[PDB]
């Protein structure tokens with residue numbers, strides 16, 4: 095809920111380097127590939143029938159950009175993640191009925207994508223800081239269930 | 241946790257009939273039997289190596305009474321569970337490092353134990369109200385992780 | 387499932403006997419009330435209390451569990467049609483199998499006071515998780 | 524695991540080689556730092572950075588995975604003693620296998636980018652979940 099200065103430095107140093115046009119689509123795409131029941135929520139996105147179909151799907155890329163933008167918004171408001179995600183929590187919980195376990199799964203896929211892009215720079219302590227962030231985002235998105 | 245007055249009456253009417261010297265030990269004992277990793281947190285309780293050892297263990301019974309008492313206190317203020325679980329959350333999260341999934345499991349074991357005791361009286365609507373309660377207790381106990 | 391788990395499951399489900407269909411329907415009703423998100427998988431159903439559709443579906447669920455008990459050493463084969471249905475066609479979230487499994491345990495506890503001992507509770511939990519693994523594979 | 528999953532896992536895990544101790548220790552460190560609750564299984568270890576105990580244990584975990592890859596069609600036999608150790612003796616929470624599996628994927632992604640494609644990511648996730656199922660049975 096609260097990041098120490100070491101954790102904040104870890105997060106902010108890496109986040110400025112993240113390609114915000116691509117990383118969200120990569121994380122959403124891998125979510126759909128690795129956890130295929132999540133495709134139930136994205137029937138309107140078209141062809142998701144193979145990994146290459148998912149990763150090349152323009153709606154996956156476009157939506158992932160919005161998802162990452164919400165993650166970026168959370169990074170700018172770490173002390174009020176619940177208020178930052180309140181409207182999205184209503185959407186995902188009351189309207190879309192996404193089980194909140196999937197919020198955890200997407201956060202962990204994002205962590206995998208950051209590791210994949212940044213290699214040795216994504217050290218165990220840097221990962222630990224990002225895990226606090228994605229857990230905080232998942233809890234905030236789940237608030238309308240709580 | 242918000243119960244309607246109808247739901248509140250159903251929950252409280254049943255709870256008045258619960259044997260508070262036994263039901264807590266039964267729920268805790270079944271948690272230790274059905275989910276044996278939880279035994280690691282109770283090594284000082286002695287023999288937990290078989291179901292009959294667990295269910296008959298005097299420390300399991302005595303501890304289960306304390307657990308049930310906290311559920312009882314929570315039932316008295318469902319709208320502000322932080323008012324009964326704030327310190328217990330520090331204990332379970334910061335000091336004992338219990339994984340919060342196990343809070344959910346214990347709540348569901350308690351629901352099973354209530355069904356076992358009350359039979360047909362534990363109707364689908366009564367269960368639904370109790371599920372709201374035990375989810376709220378688990379969420380309150382996890383507050384220090386959030 | 388250990389031999390002890392299989393023994394416990396066969397014994398418990400024998401006591402369920404001809405009530406299996408009724409218990410399946412009751413478990414579904416409990417699931418829809420306690421965890422209303424699960425209702426979204428059933429858009430064509432009447433989900434109200436006493437629904438003939440929910441009753442009929444619970445009997446199908448129960449028949450599948452009875453077959454799984456009879457074929458507990460070969461459940462991937464015995465449940466083969468249901469894996470494609472749940473994992474590919476319906477894309478049922480794995481969490482919801484835990485919810486239905488819990489409601490089945492609650493139903494069995496409410497109807498089988500003597501048989502739902504801690505050991506049998508543990509065996510039935512593992513059995514339903516094993517069924518769930520097949521349906522999500 | 525399909526043949527495609529097995530092919531993907533053998534190719535990706537083949538790239539690990541003599542890095543097994545280093546990558547296993549790194550995955551453990553990622554788990555202990557990211558999910559401090561997992562530390563309650565290792566009170567008898569020094570868990571500080573650079574720990575020789577974490578290094579030696581990390582090689583055992585990684586080498587056990589290598590053997591599992593070699594026996595991917597009969598993993599229950601290939602992991603049987605370790606299943607007794609984790610499920611019976613130590614009683615490891617199933618949640619923690621999900622946490623370590625995630626940290627193993629993170630480690631592989633950080634060290635083998637070209638191998639960690641979305642398809643291989645999925646296959647590795649399934650492999651580790653299958654290993655986890657055996658070790659919790």
Ligand code: HEM
Nearest residue numbers: 132135136160161164165182190192196197200201232235
């Ligand atoms: C965990 C972090 C997540 C974040 C930050 C997030 C964020 C967002 C955002 C910003 C939107 C757009 C809302 C709008 O434009 O009004 C959205 C929509 C959506 N999200 Fe999420 N989401 C997350 C997780 C998930 C997961 C795990 C699922 C399902 C498995 C999911 C399913 C959806 C769906 C189905 C939509 C609507 C798609 C559409 O309208 O075309 N989300 N999400």
Ligand code: HEM
Nearest residue numbers: 278281282306307310311336338342343344346347378381
């Ligand atoms: C989810 C509902 C739970 C409730 C309402 C609850 C309640 C309590 C209460 C009232 C105490 C006594 C605290 C004190 O005297 O200071 C306690 C202690 C404790 N609880 Fe829980 N608990 C829950 C879940 C769990 C779970 C799931 C575990 C482990 C798997 C656990 C492990 C412990 C331990 C180890 C202690 C300390 C016992 C000792 O002093 O030896 N609790 N809990």
Ligand code: HEM
Nearest residue numbers: 424427428446447450451468472476478482483486517518
């Ligand atoms: C122990 C777990 C389960 C068993 C044994 C089971 C069994 C079955 C069976 C036998 C059928 C009928 C197959 C047919 O008519 O061809 C079915 C259909 C279905 N099941 Fe399950 N099921 C389980 C869990 C679930 C869960 C957890 C959900 C969702 C929360 C679910 C949702 C459905 C749906 C939506 C259908 C199709 C209903 C229709 O459109 O007619 N099932 N299931």
Ligand code: HEM
Nearest residue numbers: 561564565583584587588605609613615619620623654658
């Ligand atoms: C991919 C999953 C895992 C694999 C392949 C694995 C492998 C192993 C192996 C080979 C050993 C034997 C060490 C020896 O004989 O000296 C071991 C021991 C142990 N494992 Fe695991 N393990 C896994 C997951 C876990 C998890 C998730 C935990 C807890 C969070 C855990 C806790 C332990 C502990 C406490 C020991 C005893 C260490 C000692 O006293 O030397 N394991 N594991």
